[PDB]
Every structure is written in C-alpha cells, then in structure tokens.
Design a protein around this ligand. Structure first.
Ligand SMILES: NC(=O)c1ccc[n+]([C@@H]2O[C@H](COP(=O)([O-])OP(=O)(O)OC[C@H]3O[C@@H](n4cnc5c(N)ncnc54)[C@H](OP(=O)(O)O)[C@@H]3O)[C@@H](O)[C@H]2O)c1
Ligand SMILES: NC(=O)c1ccc[n+]([C@@H]2O[C@H](COP(=O)([O-])OP(=O)(O)OC[C@H]3O[C@@H](n4cnc5c(N)ncnc54)[C@H](OP(=O)(O)O)[C@@H]3O)[C@@H](O)[C@H]2O)c1
Ligand SMILES: NC(=O)c1ccc[n+]([C@@H]2O[C@H](COP(=O)([O-])OP(=O)(O)OC[C@H]3O[C@@H](n4cnc5c(N)ncnc54)[C@H](OP(=O)(O)O)[C@@H]3O)[C@@H](O)[C@H]2O)c1
Ligand SMILES: NC(=O)c1ccc[n+]([C@@H]2O[C@H](COP(=O)([O-])OP(=O)(O)OC[C@H]3O[C@@H](n4cnc5c(N)ncnc54)[C@H](OP(=O)(O)O)[C@@H]3O)[C@@H](O)[C@H]2O)c1
Ligand SMILES: C[C@]1(O)CC(=O)c2c(cc(O)c3c2C(=O)c2cccc(O)c2C3=O)C1
Ligand SMILES: C[C@]1(O)CC(=O)c2c(cc(O)c3c2C(=O)c2cccc(O)c2C3=O)C1
Ligand SMILES: C[C@]1(O)CC(=O)c2c(cc(O)c3c2C(=O)c2cccc(O)c2C3=O)C1
Ligand SMILES: C[C@]1(O)CC(=O)c2c(cc(O)c3c2C(=O)c2cccc(O)c2C3=O)C1
Lengths: 252, 252, 245, 245
C-alpha cells in the first residue's frame, strides 16, 4: 500500500497495458480513474477487479482526438475525485491511451495522420496541461511511448512520429515542473500481448518474440510493474527520462 | 560543382537557414527550387543570387499546413523541373520550412498546436511521401530539426514535440529507402541568426550566444555547409542519422 | 528475520562501506537479500553497515578486497564464496551491484598515465572481471547492475578520465544483456547525478538539490527485483533531471 | 603541388598504412593537407600511402610508433614534430585523426586481463594522451576526430572489450569539445559500421553492403574542413544505417 492516499488517472484503461497499469496502481492503494472511449463494460470490469482486491476505482468516458475531449475527461475525473475524496487533487497521470496502425508509408492519408497525432500526442499534451492545475507537489506524470522510436519500422512510421512527439513531453515538462517536484517520464514497452487476436497467430507471435532478447513478447503486467515503480516515492530521483522496458529489444 | 546535374527542393528558402541552404546548393551546381509561402520578393532575390553566381533556380509558392498544400507544391515543382531539365526527377529534398512559437506551456491552445504540428511534421511527412515517386536512386532527404529535442525548454514544448516527430522520419524512412540508396537524415542547428529583429536585442543575443560552446549564435551559412555535405556523394554512408550542428550546444 | 521481496536471494554490493553503496546494501538487505558488504579498507564502516542490516532483521557480512590490483577478483570471490557457503551452503549469487569506484578532478593537461590506469583499473576493468567471474555462480533470473554516472552525458573537462571509465562501464550493460538474454539475467546501468556521499553542484539537478544516497538505492533495489524483469541493456537515468541540456 | 581546401594545414592520421586510416590519409592529402602517415610496423604500406599522396601532387611522410607501450606518445611526437619542422619550419598540428586501433573477437568468458589491457591501451589510452600532447602544438581552428565504432550502439557479446574501449574513446569528444570551445578546436567521434579493410556482416547495413574505406574517409575529410565548423562534441554515425535497431 505504498500509494495509499494517492489518486491516479490511467487513460486507455479498459484493456491491454492500461488495464494492467490500473490493476497494479489500484493494488498499491491508489484511487484509480479507469478511462475509456467506447469500452464501457470492459472499463467497469477493470474497476470492479480493483475493488474486488480491496482498492478503489471508477470509470471515466472520454473519446480523445476530437474537440472538447479533455474538457469531457476532466469534468468526469474531477467530479469523481471530489465525490470520493473531497478534493480534485490528481497525484498520478498515466497517458496510456493510444492508437496503432500498420500500412505502407505510400498509402498513409492525411486523415490517418491527424488521427494518429491527435490521439497519441495532442491529447496527451493537453491532458498534461489540464493536469497541472490539479496536481500536487510530488506528483507523477508517466507517458507510455514505444520502442519503435529507436527501431526503424517503415510500416509504422506515422505511429513512430507520434510517439517521438510524445517523448518530448517528458524532456520539456520535467524542466518546467522541477520545483514542484513532479517527475515526468517516458516508458517504452516493446511488443506486448494486449489480448488481441493478432498475438494468437503463431507465425506472427514467433516473429515478435524474436525481437526481445528474452525470446518472448511481454505480458502487460511486466510494463505495469515499471509504471507502478515510476509512480512511487522510490522513483523520486528519476525525471525527464526514457525508460527502456522492451525486454532488450533496443540492443541494435 | 559536385552537385552538377542534380535537382533540389529547399522549403522555406525565402529567408534564414533555407536561403543559405539554397545558396550553397545552387553554388554547388544543383538546380534549386526555392520554396516559399508569402515571401515572393524574397524568394525571387534568392533565385536571382543563385543565377547571378552562375547556377540555376526558380521559385515555388506553397502555403504548408492547409489541405492540398503538397499538391500545390509538387504541381509547381514538377512543372518547373520538367520545363528546365526535361524530367520531374528530384535528387535532393530539404525539409526546412518551419514555424517557431514561444509561450508558457499553460497558454498553448489546440489551434497553436495544430499549426505547429501541421507545418513542422505533417507537411514534411507528406512531402517525403510525394517525393518518393520522383526521386531517383542515390537521392537525398534532409530534415532540418532543432537541438531543442535534446535541451529542455518549457516555452518551446510544442515546437519541441513537432521536431521530435520530424526526427522520426529519418529513422523509419532510411530503412524503407536503403535499397534505393536514398539517405534520410536530421540536421539539428542550435540558435541561429535568421536575420530577424530578435537577434538584434543585445541582451537576448548575449543569452543565446552563451548556449554554444563557441560563445556565439550560428550564422546560417554554418548550417548550410553541413546540409551541402549531406547532399553530396561524400555523405553516402550516412543514413537515419541525427547530425548535431549546434556548435556544441548539446554538451549537457 | 524480516521478510520481503528479495527473501531467498544473495547479493554482492561492491563498495558498500559508505555512500551510495551503503544505501544500496541497507536497501537490498531490508528487502530480504543476504548482502555481502564489500570494502577496500573501510572495515569499520562496512561492519557498521553489515550490523545495521542484521539489526533490522536482515542478513549480511563483509568482504575485503582492494580492486584494480592483480588478484583483486580472486580475493573478492574467495571471501564471498566462503561467506555464502557458511550461510546458505551454496555459492549462488543472484544479484551483482558494481558500485565501487574512484573519482578525481584536475586539469586534463595534468592527467598522468598512472592516474589513467588507476581510473580504468577500478571503474571499468574490475567491473568487467567481476561480471565475468559472477557468471559461473549466477542462477537464471539473476541481476547485474552497474553504477555509472550522468557525467557520461554532461561534458566536464576536469573529469575526462572518470567519464572515459564510466563510458567503458556502460558498455557492459549493452553487450552482456544480449549475451545473457536466454538465461534471464538482466544487465543495466544506473546513472546517478550529484550525490551527497558525505565529504554549486546542487544547481545541476532540475530539483536544485544534490541527491541523498537513498534516492539512488531506491532505483537499484527496483532493478534488482522481479518488477524490473523486462528492463535489460538499459541506461537508467537517476540524476534527478540533470541530463536535461 | 595540387591545391584544395586544406592547403596550409598539417595533419596526423594514426594507423594510415592500411584500411580506413589509409583512405583518410589519401583523402586529407588530396585536399591539400601535409599528412603524417603513422604506422606501427607496416612501413612498406605506409611509404606506399605517403608515395601515393605525393604522386597526386600532395605532401606527406611516414612516422613510426607502436602505441599502447610506455613511451609511445613521445616516440610518435618525436617523429611528427621532426617531419613538420623539416617541411614547414614549425611544429603546428592543425588536424588530429585518432584512427589506429585493435580488434578482437572471442567468447566473453575467455577474455584475459592481458587482452583487456591491450584493447584499452591502444583504443582509449593512447588516443587520450595523443590528444593531451597535441594541445600544446594545435592552433585555434584545429580539428580532432576520433574513429570510434557503431558497436558502441549495437550489442555484440564477442566484442565486449572492444566496445568498452570505443565507449571510453567516445567520451574524448564530449569532454574536450567543452574544454576547447573558446580555442575553436572541434572534437568529434565518427562511428563506422562494418568496413572492408581487406582481410553476413554486409547484412547489418541498411544498404546490404560492407563499407569501402573511402566512404568513411569522405566523412572524416568533411569534419576536418571549415564546412564542419559548427559540429563539435558530436557522435557522427557513418555506419550506412546499421544503427537502425
Ligand atoms: N501493445 C504493444 O505492443 C505496445 C507496444 C509498445 C507501446 N504500446 C503503447 O501502449 C499503449 C496501450 O496499447 P495496448 O496495445 O495495450 O492497448 P490496445 O487494446 O489498443 O488498447 C488501447 C486503449 O486505448 C484506448 N483508446 C484508444 N483510442 C482512444 C481514444 N481515441 N480516446 C480515448 N481512449 C482511446 C482504448 O479504449 P477503448 O477500449 O474505449 O476503445 C483502449 O483502452 C498505447 O499507447 C500503445 O501505443 C503498445
Ligand atoms: N533559427 C533558429 O534558431 C533555428 C534553430 C534550429 C532550427 N531551426 C529550424 O530551421 C528552419 C528555418 O528557420 P529559420 O529561423 O531559418 O527561418 P525563419 O525566418 O522562420 O524562416 C522560415 C521559412 O519557412 C517558411 N515557412 C514558414 N511557414 C510556412 C508555411 N506554413 N508554408 C510554407 N513555408 C513556410 C517561410 O517562408 P515565407 O518567407 O514565405 O513566410 C520562411 O522562408 C526551421 O525548421 C526551424 O525550426 C531554426
Ligand atoms: N558521488 C556522486 O556524486 C556520484 C555520482 C554519480 C555516480 N557515482 C558513482 O557512485 C559510486 C559510489 O559513489 P560514492 O560517491 O558513494 O563513492 P564513495 O563515497 O567515495 O565510496 C566509494 C566506495 O568504493 C570503495 N572503493 C574505492 N576504491 C576502491 C577500490 N580501489 N577497490 C575496492 N573498493 C574501492 C570504497 O571502499 P572504502 O571505504 O574501503 O574506501 C567505498 O566503499 C561510484 O562508482 C561513483 O563513481 C557517484
Ligand atoms: N574495420 C571495421 O569494420 C571497422 C568498423 C568500425 C570502426 N573501425 C575502426 O576503424 C579504425 C581503423 O580500422 P581498420 O579496420 O582500417 O584497421 P586495420 O585494417 O587493422 O588497420 C589498423 C591500423 O592501426 C595500426 N595499428 C594497429 N595497432 C597499432 C598499435 N598498437 N600502435 C600503432 N598503430 C597500430 C596499424 O598499423 P600497422 O600497419 O603497422 O599494423 C594499421 O595502420 C580502427 O580504430 C577500428 O577500430 C573499423
Ligand atoms: C500491438 C501491435 O499491433 C503489434 C506491433 O507490431 C507493435 C505495435 C505497437 C508497438 O508499440 C510496437 C509493436 C511492435 O511490434 C514492436 C516490436 C519491436 C519493438 C517495439 O518497440 C514494438 C512496438 O513498440 C502494435
Ligand atoms: C530563432 C528563435 O526565435 C530563437 C530561439 O529561441 C530558438 C528558435 C528555434 C530553435 O530551433 C532554437 C532556438 C534556440 O534558442 C535554441 C537555443 C539553444 C539550442 C537550440 O537548439 C535552440 C533552437 O533550436 C526560435
Ligand atoms: C562526488 C564528486 O566528487 C562530485 C562530482 O563532481 C561528481 C562526482 C561523481 C559523479 O558521478 C558526478 C559528479 C558530478 O559533479 C556530476 C555533476 C552533474 C552530473 C553528473 O552526472 C555528475 C556526476 O555523475 C564526484
Ligand atoms: C573488421 C572486424 O573484424 C569485423 C567486425 O566484426 C567489426 C570490426 C570492427 C568494427 O568497428 C565493427 C565490426 C562489426 O562487425 C560491426 C557490425 C555492426 C555494426 C558495427 O558498428 C560494427 C563495427 O563497428 C572488426
């Protein structure tokens, strides 16, 4: 219970890595806002499983990448935190929600690009901007990046660009927020089983396993344990940092 | 005349670093498309000075960051290259055009963000995408980044994000384009006198000089000489690389 | 006997008599590891640490070895393998923390070949051979952590040899992580910024303080735990935002 | 006498008898620099390079020095400072290229303390002291370039000591660039990928070839020219897209 008394927002917490992060933070004693876009039943399962194991949670619906998305998010977040704790204080922020798309660089449209950049970099920036008014000293901001910012992959170039824009938040905000003692950091998972049918195809799973020096794709729990650490007092002297959680995928 | 027979596009070539790059490429014997948005007289001065010194140039008007911008750009580029050389071949691409904005991270609007990302990352990506159909083997793509991708500066965070998205192009496209022997690279200038009134204020110029290990802001020619090198056969074994041209500003 | 997440594991922390190494030792011991507290000549300090760990219910002992002299690794592992047998009946080493090291300022014009050999001998060479030797006694799931320095990222003319040595050290995490990947040994570098070991520099951290050794120990303890199982070959910045340009 | 952009400058290229160093020498000489072609024991190769440069209208001579043994730097600068006086009447050294180095594969379990000392002695130590000594005879606007390796970026277990040495070398560009900034000496690292020096590896470059020594020389010649005046402290990737993950 090292996060006892703390509050946390995890975006994209209805499934995958975000679900795992939400479960781990919850288990550590934080009140967790489990955020989602359209996965309402899934978000409620994640919220229940935190409570089931002795913690505290609720869900917040906000479709990111459209106008007024952050407003919707923080209206639901701050209301939920008020009614439950008596304040709007947000101690921990995990920008996890993300979209992925594969395709030849030749076939990328401007619509695809805007969507990618809107969800993966723009929303996170404005979520941080909005979080600054309600985040107490000693707060934590963690952005879930991708190892593809260090590994060339033409089929994922626009995704890559969007994550490279995301990583800049940690660098520039950690300087802004130093005297508030708010740490801002990027976690880069490698290929991670997010429970979607793609990781069931044995040939595809073989290929992705090869990329880690461990010979496996990651379980979401493995990323979640790194995020839990960054959220704790134990990671207080880490800020503006790129954390390689790819299982040795970035070895060249 | 080591670029004799080559063709080149420099975006944002009406002034500043782009003007300098255009002048240096021209001098080396390349036909240069001097690109601009609204600086028509300035672009024509740059085109004349290349001709004046014995080279070949024309200007192309394209306002970037709006729909159909790339179409406008490449309709003018390819027509100009056809009428002058008999082909639409583009040997060299310099994504230079850029917008800069300073302000507290708290005061950034979504409009400001879209503009920043649209001009500084999106346009460059689609310019590259469009350039691939007309670029011969042995071609060159050079993106002008910024040292602020390695130096925290809260007042320039959105600018930073946009350049971090830009740097990803070199990483992912250099893998895509390896077998065509097209090199893709990022140049990061530090603070550079772009001939704008800001570098006239002696207190501001003092501050910016301090940041280089040389104790000076850069002349645009100094960046241009690096770009000329990357454009040549001499830089043929450099691809997917981040070139620090900041005059020792990135030393920590 | 106080139980925690490292209950069952053995650990070697080089240079655990004072400073960062002491904090790492205290921290790993507190998490349940049996901790070999290594030292060159601070036996009194080392015993005080070993005693500190055993008082709070952990388990520890001290090992004497001067590093960067011929025979250094032999003497070190003689004492360690002995202590571990005594206490466990096995030579198994689950956790290796290469923390011991030397620091020296001075104009780069005045650096001598002797000064150079000293720096490399302690800061890079001994760490390599300590790792080489540990492989024979390290079980799968083990942990190797090399305490580097943020000075490999920040230019400091008066500390060029020291930087050189730490840059050589950082390469151990890169190349070994590939080597040990199938044996599940994670190999990482942790880079502290300015830290009050006890002996202007505060202006370097974004926080405007020098670190306390506990702030650094907390990162090392993390890397040593199962929670850090998917981090290997990494450079972990623990400088408190000193590498921000 | 064939004139170019380095007309007026003197240069030292360590290990210029064969391989990358030969290409650098030929290239700097062709650009007008008076080139000291250094070697350990390949005097025939070195003369052939020196002759090659003088035939094409440049200027050169050879210098004998075994590196990584006591006295190495003295012997080196004895020969250089002599050659330069003879030809110019001054000891001025405008350009220093630390290219000489040793390579060795082998299981990391079989690396010996002797093998380690050899690697560091040649690849990092001598380069440091060659730089230290050159400062006394290098005019403002000078150039220092250290030939590193992309192996500092790509994990290779069988080349851990070599990587270590090059990582130590890379630190020279970081710390000296700050030191020399006001004297306008640029200090850079250039990192080749797999290069055919003449003695599967092709699959590493995005181009699917091993480099020719000329491809690397072309980057070094650039760094040595005024065109590279605003690049210092940099790591220059010349691996032909080998560091792409
Ligand atoms: N999976 C990997 O291999 C991998 C590797 C490296 C990094 N990452 C990063 O890790 C993060 C999580 O990805 P994942 O694979 O674990 O999950 P995956 O199933 O996509 O799940 C994505 C989550 O983000 C939410 N989301 C998507 N678009 C949204 C939007 N426009 N507005 C609000 N929420 C939105 C989804 O909510 P709903 O359920 O409501 O649709 C869902 O909870 C992403 O940032 C991804 O880039 C993933
Ligand atoms: N200056 C520095 O200190 C510095 C440092 C590091 C990196 N950089 C980068 O270097 C590049 C050049 O900047 P600078 O300071 O030299 O020039 P600065 O005067 O802004 O000039 C910018 C150029 O980009 C063009 N441009 C701007 N917006 C455009 C748009 N929306 N569509 C088409 N063209 C547009 C401008 O054309 P018009 O004349 O038609 O308006 C102008 O030629 C930028 O990418 C900048 O980020 C600059
Ligand atoms: N201090 C900083 O600001 C800072 C910042 C970044 C990184 N670091 C690194 O953090 C590590 C610990 O730093 P520290 O400041 O805590 O150092 P410290 O206070 O000087 O203590 C160094 C430890 O190393 C041992 N040691 C020194 N030379 C040795 C040798 N030749 N053979 C065996 N042991 C030797 C000492 O043992 P004895 O008690 O017997 O002498 C002592 O336990 C070092 O590697 C240092 O490079 C320090
Ligand atoms: N080859 C690659 O694929 C590759 C890739 C990346 C980086 N590099 C680096 O590129 C540089 C040159 O590589 P290369 O492949 O061209 O090497 P090379 O073919 O083996 O030649 C090495 C040069 O170093 C000299 N040398 C060796 N040991 C010496 C010593 N102890 N003292 C003085 N000189 C010594 C040799 O002189 P003698 O003729 O008298 O023996 C020779 O001129 C090296 O630093 C290497 O690490 C090479
Ligand atoms: C889950 C997925 O559909 C599969 C995938 O292709 C991927 C995706 C997102 C990612 O961030 C990565 C990867 C990835 O492999 C992959 C492989 C190797 C290293 C990586 O960092 C990654 C990724 O970061 C989208
Ligand atoms: C020309 C300007 O109005 C002035 C400026 O603030 C700046 C601008 C753009 C930049 O890319 C940089 C810098 C910069 O200082 C500066 C200072 C120190 C290191 C840098 O890389 C930079 C920049 O890259 C906008
Ligand atoms: C304790 C000390 O005498 C002080 C010091 O100079 C230092 C020392 C060791 C270090 O590892 C660092 C630094 C350091 O400043 C310093 C300043 C700014 C960033 C750093 O990473 C460091 C260091 O890593 C030796
Ligand atoms: C000539 C050689 O015996 C071959 C070799 O193993 C190598 C050698 C020196 C090097 O610097 C490299 C490499 C290298 O592959 C290699 C493979 C992939 C990336 C690299 O940067 C490298 C190297 O830098 C020694």
């Amino acid at each position: 219970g090292n996060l006892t008394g703390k509050t946390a927002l995890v975006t994209g917490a209805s499934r995958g890595i975000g679900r795992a992060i939400a479960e781990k933070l919850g288990y550590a004693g934080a009140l967790v806002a489990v955020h989602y876009a359209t996965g309402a039943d899934a978000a409620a399962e994640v919220a229940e499983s935190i409570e089931k194991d002795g913690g505290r949670a609720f869900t917040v619906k906000a479709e990111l990448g459209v106008p007024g998305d952050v407003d919707v998010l923080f209206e639901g977040l701050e209301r939920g935190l008020k009614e439950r704790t008596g304040a709007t204080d947000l101690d921990i922020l995990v920008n996890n929600a993300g979209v992925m798309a594969m395709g030849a660089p030749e076939e990328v449209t401007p619509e695809m690009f805007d969507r990618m950049m809107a969800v993966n970099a723009k929303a996170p920036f404005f979520i941080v901007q909005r979080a600054l008014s309600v985040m107490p000293d000693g707060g934590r901001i963690i952005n879930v990046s991708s190892g593809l910012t260090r590994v060339a992959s033409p089929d994922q170039v626009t995704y890559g660009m969007s994550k490279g824009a995301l990583e800049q938040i940690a660098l520039h905000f950690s300087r802004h927020l130093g005297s508030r003692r708010i740490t801002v950091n990027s976690v880069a998972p490698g290929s991670t089983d997010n429970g979607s049918a793609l990781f069931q195809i044995p040939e595809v799973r073989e290929t992705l396993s090869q990329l880690s020096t461990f010979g496996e794709v990651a379980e979401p729990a493995a990323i979640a344990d790194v995020v839990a650490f960054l959220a704790s007092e134990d990671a207080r002297w880490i800020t503006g940092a790129f954390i390689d959680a790819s299982g040795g995928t970035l070895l060249g």
